[PDB]
Every structure is written in structure tokens, then in C-alpha cells.
Ligand binder design. Structure first.
Ligand SMILES: Cc1cc2nc3c(=O)[nH]c(=O)nc-3n(C[C@H](O)[C@H](O)[C@H](O)COP(=O)(O)OP(=O)(O)OC[C@H]3O[C@@H](n4cnc5c(N)ncnc54)[C@H](O)[C@@H]3O)c2cc1C
Ligand SMILES: Cc1cc2nc3c(=O)[nH]c(=O)nc-3n(C[C@H](O)[C@H](O)[C@H](O)COP(=O)(O)OP(=O)(O)OC[C@H]3O[C@@H](n4cnc5c(N)ncnc54)[C@H](O)[C@@H]3O)c2cc1C
Lengths: 607, 612
């Protein structure tokens, strides 16, 4: 072990083992997760050349093969709990996305929960056996956010009792779906339903796209890879063009609506919750690499005659990393809170889940790159593992609701809540602070209240600005568009308050007093950093005075010093194995330099 | 031409051709640049497969080759003139870094400036035929920022009149230098000079590393590529392990220090300037792609049931992109001001270049990714060109002085300047605003510069006073510096922000064309007012502005977005990037995205077969 890391670990104020239990949810969840990862770690079937050394084609081949053996192995070892499947999937794929994600994550769940019994007979087992490989084709070249503008049609033919699936234009072609290019022989296709001569809107269809066995595209199917991307090298993100392709009537998903044989027409928070936890995980891994490597890397001078200190001793380096470390923990607890209240429980839930998806993904996105730039040159090399974490996490800000649009869906629920209050009614939950229309900087409860007042101020500015535009502009929709920057600021401040409140609240449930102490130092640093970084939002409305902002900035610098001796153990508690970080700089043992020279010598331009 | 791009172009308030002249410096520089680009455009020798469809080894092969053909062709056409060489190199390489950069920019220039006739006679002449290909090996796996901590040794042997170049440790190994991997047969190596007695600190040594013919590595020499990176696929960024390797004593560069045969020992600022222009250019390309694509892309609804509008009509899309286009222009004018100051030039220049290199590169870095995310899904595809612009620009924040270190140099200068003014002496230059230590008009660039001045003065004074407090507390200046370093970086940031607003504001008064001046005025006001909006706290404290003034700043930014909307396509056209320089289906001049996108994908590698 590198003696800087052993020393850092020996001087910690808390037992990281106990903090891993808190993050997993219980000691048994830690044991069960470690057992699953340790099932995989030395399995040769899950070993391969470093993926940064391979072509995109080879990376795709490696990932598809792993996803197959892994479906087989999970069944052999009888792993079947949804948490456990995800522990297994995560560790097999080492942070990379995996080509059966849509089959296992959308196609199979959709069959079990949205398909008819006769659809399940026909499709479910061949899908579970990977005889049928499925994807979900929603987005078109021309439309992703506005699904009402999707051009794909499903036209009912009563003479043959089929749906005719059509891509009438180049923009109409399905674009992005994972596994669509090369892997899948079936797709669930979102299409505008036309029956008689009327459109009834968006409905979902099971569409065979390739021959089972041969994998040849069916007549009237054009399908392929959309080409290389910033990341997702391992995923055959694909296009699908349908030329009036016919399917049985009975391939429509009729859970909420039906077409009769004569043509008559009768009348997710899970994934956004998962994405907050993925934001936590990605930022956590990035903080682990950069903080360990900051404890290993010596550079430059503080005391002029003295040896090069660890760069983590520089107040600037602390300022780059510790507020991210605090942010990581905060997001870990927001992700847990939302997972544990989705099973408990709605307009607020939808609004809250959209906003936190956007808030956590944006903030983690920026975090990861600040972590990479904090390592200096070696950060930029794939030896850091930080480029792959960035490029594979960043599309979280665009898919499953583009972040700006999500914040506007949040703002709609905040304006609805504002109008409810000013019309004399009462609102509930996280927006209950809208009913009410001097800070102690070492109190999480007191900073939560500061963040509450910031949100109420920005929500009232958005409402009033909106009210003036509604009175002045030619349409309410123009008024909305011309208030949209202020509506996003309101949704943002709302989300930031929710994160402070949830992290503050978690502290009271920590049983171990040493862990409660260091999490409180993270919760205070998160809250105080956010005030420092948004001072104007606390100064206006007189929520806080200039002297208090001075004291906020003094306390942030002290918290950096408090956190320094606990930083390594705090990232150690995330419990990422070296193979999950993919990082020479961030190895558990801190032996970077001998391993960097090996990695570099073995790399491809030296054959 | 896409009819949305035709309509926007036709209703522009100004002539983008005259703005290109302002950016290039004259109508003749524009014409000459375009001529060099257009002879490179029709040269079959500079043409290759889509770089996005190739492996890293193929990318490197395509690059070193275009770089060799490029040296030969610039001699043939007599392309001398630094501006012309830059225009030629920029266009051949299409935004990618160039694997002869260290050869042409550090090896040959160092031989011409520093080498004695003897050294120049046996080195610079075959180097000018590409028989010798050199590099400059400064950084080690263990040291980059702190050069004094370099571990490579050059020990003098008085007997055999040689230097011993040794790499004692794995950390000592030279690491990163462009060309060092595969390209170079020769390196200027930076080492600690030990002669008989002890060490006389950092000196340069000419170390041949590969044979001139076999290109085989010399005895004592271990050399290779450091592996794949976030970008720079085209560059064999390299390592160099020297095993007590022997070189003649006349291999030491001795323009300012010498070692006699008796072993007797006797006696980054142009680059930083250039990187400011690089920050400007990279941000400008990203704005070009995102603003054109935003004028082409229709999505979602304003009045429900009316046609889906161009996404550039959404205020949020305007707020992501117009502030960045205003920054791209600010940065073009800061780059030109640096170039113009350097040529002409009683220190401030070192401080100001460091701080402006860090300020601009950090801000451009953030802005390129914002442009990419503004394009939605298609942004993330290499079809957008934006992932490449970002990965090949981003190391600018790390190399040629790590940005935080550079802001800390700028802050040494600001603290010295502060102490000087508070001891009664007058400072000059961009810090002359400190001399003046003890209602803002938001339509006046001059009054907005003044606000920025007061913001900077406030944060400089806070850094200074916080530093004095820690000095008396800890009784160590170097420790008190560390414990103030976050405040000190904040003072340099605000200083550099002020300088940018000042220069943009002052550029507006030299614009001849009234219509151009009026729109650049709108960009300058948008830059200034967005910066206040984003930093309202730094203006609210010390009573520089009031809450009601921040309210009006916010109203005026919303107004300038609407005004800039009808000029935004023309403003990005005026950067005069060719399609092949942008490398972007989304950002093509003609706005024909969708049919071109489908062709691009259909021809991409995984569609060589239907079943993989
Ligand atoms: C790696 C990756 C994997 C994907 N996987 C899948 C998949 O498996 N299946 C699939 O069907 N799709 C998939 N997608 C596509 C994804 O669903 C879309 O990218 C997403 O819906 C965003 O839509 P868009 O890309 O068309 O962006 P657009 O909707 O075109 O928007 C682009 C810009 O317009 C702005 N904008 C749009 N509407 C508004 C509005 N109403 N108000 C204000 N601003 C607005 C956005 O904020 C953004 O700034 C994937 C995408 C990626 C990048
Ligand atoms: C793409 C690329 C190309 C390169 N090409 C070349 C090349 O051609 N030739 C060459 O010689 N080099 C090259 N380099 C290396 C480059 O010069 C170094 O990366 C740079 O000098 C930074 O030092 P470092 O990487 O050792 O980071 P470090 O110096 O180890 O710094 C890492 C961290 O420590 C912090 N830190 C360091 N010192 C201080 C301090 N005094 N105060 C506070 N914090 C501090 C930094 O802020 C940073 O966050 C290249 C690098 C890259 C990424």
C-alpha cells in the first residue's frame, strides 16, 4: 500500500465499513453486493483487453458477449432480485452501458406488465431465452422531446387485420435506440395510430425487424448503426426505417386502448429515480479517483525549503474536490430517499422526480470534469478512467427528458402550486413552504430554512414575471416562453433546497456518532458552498446580510481543513473495486507510477 | 440552402463579410486566408476517410503524413509569414492537433535562437529537410508544474568531455511531449546540470534518441507512446527513459550558461497569448454549430397547434447560446489585443497573459460542452463535430501552465500591485484601477466597465486583507498564501473578467461600419450584463449595484436575447469557418442536416455488414 494512503486511512475519524452499510442500506446488502461482485471479479468469461485499446467494432463484440454469458450466469447462480441483477450488471460492465440494456430494461418488463396474456404466450419466453431480442424505438431523427410531432404511423387495415408501420420521411426514421443497429430482431415502436380515417395519437407496437436465426432484415425494414458518439462505443445505437411494414393487429400494446377487428378505437419515476442514483454513483467514482490521486500526487511547494506536499494539501485542490465529495454524498441520500418513497407512493412526485433528474445529472456532469481537470495531465489520459466516466454519464442530461424541459415541467408544478396558494388553498409536501408568502451557519436545520426562503423568492419572481407577460403578450405560451429562464431558475432553487433538506434530515437517523459527525461536516460544506456560489440569491430579499456571507465564506475554508484528514476514508466508503473505477490514478493501493508505466508500455502504438 | 437559414441570413442587420475583415484584421488577410484554405480544399494530397471512422493508429498515420506533405507544400508555395503558416496548418489539420508541433514550434525555433554555429551546423540543417525530427521533453511522469522538482540528470564527465543523461526513477521518465512516442529521432531534454561538485539547476541538452535511417532506438534510450487519451489521438504524446546515456559536451545549449572541458560552470508568454486566440476560435466554432443547428432544428410548441418552432426561438436556448456568442466575440478581441500588444512591447504582461490564458480557456471549455448539450441527442453523436472540438481544446486548461497555478501567478502580481498602492506608490497598466482605492448605466459599455473595475478592486482588497490576517496568525508567508489561495484565484478571475469587458468596450469605438458597431455593441452589453446577472453577489456587496439594478440587468439581458435572435446566424457566418473546419453535419453552412445525417450514418463502419 502507498504510505500516504495507509497514513490517510489510519488517521480517519470514523469506520468507512459502517458508512458503506449506510450507503447500501444494511450490512446484509453490503455482504450480498460484495458476494455478487466477488462471484464475477476472477471469472475469466468477464475478462478482456483494456477497452480503450480496441476499435469500436471490437468493443461492441466484447460487450455483447459479456451481456450474453452474464444473462446465463445470473440464471445459473439463481440471481433474480432486481437489486441483485443490478449489482451483477454494474460489476460485469465496469461503468460502460451494455447492449441488452433495452431488452432486459424495457422489452421484457413491457411484456410482463403492459402486454396481454396471448402476447406473453407468443413473446415472453422467446424473449427471456434471448431467442427474441427487443428494443424500444421512440425517438426519430426529427423528434425526441415533442413526441406529439413523431411522424411514424401505424395504420389499421381491416381487410387483413394488420397494422401497417411506416417511416414516411427521412426525419421519421427511428434514431438512437440502444440495441437497434445490430443486436435486436424485435422493437417496440411508438407510432401515431390511424384507424378509420382518424388519428388517435401515440401507441406502442411490437415490430419484428429481423428473421430469428438468420438475423436478416425483414422485407420493408432498413436498420443499422447511427455511427460513433462521444461515448457509448459498446452500444449499437440504431436507426429503423419502415416501408409500410405489416404486423398483426394483436401486436399493438392495448393496456389503456384497443382496436377491434373492424377498426373501432376504444378510449417514468422509476427511471428518473434510477438516474439520480446514477448521478450520485458517477460523481462518487470521479471523487474517489481524484481524491486518492490527490493524496498520492506530490507537486510544487508550500514551505519553501520543504519537500513537495501531496497536492490535496493545497486549499485550491480541496476547494475543487471537497464540495464535490459533499455533493456526491448528498446525491447518494437523495437517490436512496427517492427509491424508498417510490415504493411508498403524485403531481408533486412527477414534478419532483423530473427536476431532481435534471439537477443531479447537470451537477454530476460538471463534477466529473472538474475531477478530471483536478488530476492535471494524467487526468486527460485514459489511465485516469475519468474520460470514460464522463462520456458514458453525460447523455443522462439529454435522454429520459432533456434537462431544460424537465426543469420547465418542474416549473409548471411550482406555478400551479403558487396559484393554488394565492387563491387561498393549502399545498402539501416539498412545496408546503409556499403557504408562508437570522441564519445559524452550523445548523443544517437553519441552512435548510435559508434554502427554503431562496426558493420561495425565486418561485414568486417567476410567478410575477409570468403574470406580467400573460397580461402583455399575444399568447399565454409566448408569456411562458419569455419567462422560461426565470422558471428554470425557480425549479433549480426548488431542487437545491430539496437536496439540502433531505441531506440535513438524513443526519438525524445516523446511529454511529463519528459517521454522523463527518456527514454533518459534508452537509454543512454542501449547504455553505451553495450559499457562497449563489450569494446574490441570499443577499436579495435579505435572507442573509453581507457580513453573514463573509462568515459563510470563512466557514467553507475551515470545513475544507476539517474534511482533509477524512477525505480518503470517505471515498473508500463508496466501496468501488479497482475494476469498477478502471483507473491507474485511483487504485485502492495508491501504487500509481509503476502501474502507469506498465499500462502505457502495453498500449497499442507500442506493438 | 435550408430556407430557415436563407430567411435569417436575408434579414441580418449588417454585412457579415465586413465582420470577417475585422476578425482577420484586413480585407486582404481575409482574401489571402480563403485562398490558402481553397488551395488546400482542392488538393487531393490533403484528402482522407472521415477521421471519426478510423482507429487511433490510422488517425496518427493520417496526421503525421498530412504534416509532412504540409512542410513540403508550404516551402513549394513559399508560405512564410506566421499568419499564413497558421492559416495553412489550421486548415490542413481541420482543428486536430498536429504531430510536428514541437518540431516546428519548439525544436527548430530553439536551435535558431539558442544553438551555436557548430550545434546549428550538425542539427538544424537536416532538421529543415525532416531528416532530423525533434521534440522538447520538459515534463516527467512525476513533475509538470514544479520544474525545479524534475529528476532527470545531466552529470558532466570531465575525462571523456561528455554529459551523462540519466532517468533514475519511473517518475523521472519524460512524459507527454508531442512527437516523443514514434515521430521524433531527436529531443531537446531539460535536466538538472550536475558538474563535479553539485547541481546548477535546469539546463537544456540535445539528445539524439533514434537512428537517422532505421529510426531504431539508440542504446540507453527507452521511448514509446503514453497510451490513448480523452482526445489527441493524432499525437504520439510520448515517454523517454534515459539509462546514463552519453552525449558530447557541445550538445548542451550554451547561449547563457556554459560548462568548460574542465567541467567548469559559467553564469511561455507568446504561447499563452496564442492560447487566448485558440480559446476564442474553439468557442466560436461551437457557437457556429449550435446556433446554425438551433435555426435548422424545429421542436415542441409555443402556441399549441401552430407549427413547431425553430428551437432558437425558445428563450432558454437563446440564454444557453447568445451569451456564449457574445463571449466568443469578446475573446476574439482579447486575442487580437494580446497579439497587437506583444508585437509592440517597465511584468504586468506575464501576469495578464497567465490570467487571460486561464480565464479564456476555462470559459471556452465550459461553453463548448454547453453548445453540445444545446443540440440535444444529435450533439452527442460525432455528426455534430462538438465532442472532437471539446476533447482537443480541453487540455489547454492543463498544459502551458495549469490554470489554477496561472491564476495564482496573476494574484502574485495583484498582491504586489495592492501593497505598492497602499505604500503610496502609483501602479500603471490594467492594475491602474487599484490607485483609486478608498449610479451604473446598463446601456453604457463605459459605465459597465467601471462596475467590473469596482468588483475586481473589492475582491483584490478582500484577498489582500485576508492574506495579512493569515500571515500574522501563522507566522509563515508561504502557508498564509495557501490558506488565502481560493480568495486570490477569485481576485484574478474578477480582474481578468474586468479586463475582457474593458477591451470589448474599447474595441466598439474603433468599429467604422455603424451597423456592425451596433450589433457588436449588443454583444458587448450582453457579455457585461450576463456576467453581472451570473455574479449578482459580487456587485451587490460593497454597494456597487442595488437589488433593483440587478432586476433591470435581468430585464435587459432578456431584451438583448430577442434583439440578437435576428442577427445570430449572420454573427456565426462572419467567423467564416468552412464545413470541413467545423466537421459537423448539424452545423453545415447550407443547413441541409437531415439527408446528410442519414448518408453519414449509413456509410459508418458497423454498417459494412447487416449481421455483426
Ligand atoms: C446515448 C443516447 C441514447 C439514447 N437512447 C435512446 C433509446 O434507447 N431510445 C430512444 O427512443 N431514444 C434514445 N435516445 C434519444 C433521446 O430520447 C433523445 O435524445 C431525447 O428525447 C432528447 O430529444 P432530442 O435529442 O430530439 O433533442 P431535442 O428535443 O431536439 O431538443 C434539442 C434542444 O431543444 C431544446 N428544446 C426542445 N424542446 C424544448 C422546449 N419545449 N422548451 C425549451 N427548449 C426545448 C432542448 O432543451 C435542447 O436544448 C438516446 C439518446 C442518446 C444521446
Ligand atoms: C494533451 C497534453 C499534451 C501535452 N503535451 C506536452 C508537450 O508537448 N510537452 C510537454 O513538455 N508537456 C506536455 N504536456 C504536459 C503538461 O505540460 C503538464 O500536464 C502541465 O505542465 C501540468 O502539470 P501536471 O500534469 O504534472 O499536473 P500537476 O502539476 O501534477 O498538477 C495537478 C494538480 O495539482 C495542482 N497544483 C500543482 N501545483 C500547485 C500549486 N503550486 N498550487 C496549487 N495547486 C497546484 C494543480 O492545480 C492541479 O489541480 C501535455 C499535457 C497534455 C494533457
Amino acid at each position: 500500500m502507498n504510505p500516504d494512503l495507509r497514513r490517510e486511512r489510519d488517521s480517519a475519524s470514523f469506520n468507512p465499513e459502517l458508512l458503506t452499510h449506510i450507503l447500501d442500506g444494511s450490512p446484509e446488502k453490503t455482504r450480498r453486493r460484495r458476494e455478487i461482485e466477488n462471484m464475477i471479479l476472477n471469472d475469466p468469461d468477464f475478462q478482456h483487453e483494456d477497452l480503450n485499446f480496441l476499435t469500436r467494432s471490437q468493443r461492441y463484440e466484447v460487450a455483447v458477449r459479456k451481456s450474453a454469458i452474464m444473462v446465463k450466469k445470473m440464471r445459473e447462480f439463481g440471481i433474480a432480485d432486481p437489486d441483485e441483477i443490478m449489482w451483477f450488471k454494474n460489476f460485469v460492465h465496469r461503468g460502460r452501458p451494455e447492449p441488452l440494456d433495452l431488452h432486459l430494461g424495457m422489452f421484457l418488463p413491457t411484456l410482463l406488465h403492459q402486454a396481454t396474456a396471448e402476447q406473453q404466450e407468443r413473446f415472453f419466453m422467446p424473449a427471456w431465452n434471448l431467442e427474441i431480442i427487443g428494443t424500444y424505438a421512440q425517438t426519430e431523427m426529427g423528434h425526441g422531446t415533442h413526441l406529439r410531432g413523431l411522424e411514424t404511423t401505424a395504420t389499421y387495415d381491416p381487410e387483413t387485420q394488420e397494422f401497417i408501420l411506416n417511416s414516411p420521411t427521412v426525419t421519421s426514421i427511428k434514431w438512437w435506440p440502444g440495441g437497434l443497429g445490430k443486436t435486436s430482431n424485435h422493437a417496440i415502436v411508438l407510432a401515431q395510430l390511424i384507424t378509420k380515417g382518424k388519428c388517435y395519437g401515440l401507441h406502442a407496437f411490437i415490430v419484428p425487424i429481423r428473421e430469428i436465426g438468420t438475423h436478416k432484415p425483414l422485407p420493408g425494414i432498413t436498420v443499422g448503426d447511427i455511427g460513433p458518439k462521444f461515448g457509448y462505443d459498446e452500444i449499437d445505437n440504431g436507426y429503423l426505417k419502415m416501408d409500410n411494414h405489416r404486423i398483426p393487429r394483436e401486436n399493438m400494446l392495448m393496456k389503456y386502448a384497443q382496436v377491434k377487428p373492424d377498426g373501432t378505437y376504444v378510449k417514468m419515476v422509476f427511471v428518473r429515480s434510477f438516474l439520480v442514483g446514477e448521478a450520485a454513483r458517477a460523481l462518487s467514482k470521479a471523487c474517489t479517483i481524484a481524491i486518492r490521486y490527490s493524496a498520492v500526487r506530490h507537486q510544487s511547494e508550500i514551505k519553501p525549503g520543504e519537500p513537495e506536499p501531496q497536492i490535496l494539501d493545497f486549499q485550491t485542490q480541496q476547494y475543487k474536490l471537497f464540495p464535490l465529495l459533499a455533493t456526491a454524498y448528498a446525491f447518494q441520500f437523495v437517490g436512496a430517499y427517492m427509491k424508498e418513497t417510490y415504493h411508498r407512493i403524485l403531481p408533486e412526485l412527477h414534478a419532483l422526480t423530473a427536476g431532481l433528474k435534471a439537477f443531479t445529472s447537470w451537477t454530476a456532469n460538471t463534477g466529473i470534469e472538474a475531477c478530471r481537470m483536478a488530476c492535471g495531465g494524467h487526468g486527460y489520459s485514459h489511465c485516469s478512467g475519468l474520460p470514460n466516466i464522463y462520456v458514458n454519464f453525460t447523455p443522462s442530461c439529454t435522454f429520459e427528458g432533456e434537462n431544460t424541459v424537465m426543469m420547465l415541467q418542474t416549473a409548471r408544478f411550482l406555478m400551479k402550486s403558487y396559484d393554488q396558494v394565492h387563491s387561498g388553498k393549502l399545498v402539501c409536501g416539498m412545496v408546503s413552504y409556499l403557504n408562508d408568502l437570522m441564519v445559524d451557519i452550523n445548523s443544517p436545520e437553519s441552512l435548510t430554512e435559508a434554502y427554503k426562503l431562496r426558493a420561495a423568492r425565486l418561485v414568486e419572481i417567476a410567478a410575477k414575471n409570468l403574470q406580467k407577460e400573460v397580461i402583455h403578450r399575444k399568447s399565454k405560451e409566448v408569456a411562458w416562453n419569455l419567462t422560461s429562464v426565470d422558471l428554470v431558475r425557480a425549479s433549480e432553487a426548488h431542487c437545491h433546497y430539496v437536496v439540502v433538506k433531505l441531506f440535513s434530515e438524513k443526519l438525524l437517523k445516523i446511529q454511529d456518532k463519528a459517521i454522523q459527525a463527518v456527514l454533518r461536516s459534508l452537509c454543512l460544506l454542501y449547504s455553505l458552498y451553495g450559499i457562497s456560489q449563489n450569494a446574490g440569491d441570499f443577499l436579495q430579499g435579505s435572507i442573509m446580510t453581507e457580513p453573514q456571507i463573509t462568515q459563510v465564506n470563512q466557514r467553507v475554508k475551515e470545513l475544507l481543513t476539517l474534511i482533509r484528514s477524512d477525505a480518503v476514508a470517505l471515498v473508500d466508503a463508496f466501496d468501488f473495486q479497482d475494476v469498477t473505477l478502471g483507473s491507474v490514478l485511483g487504485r485502492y493501493d495508491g501504487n500509481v507510477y509503476e502501474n502507469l508505466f506498465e499500462w502505457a508500455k502495453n498500449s497499442p502504438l507500442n506493438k
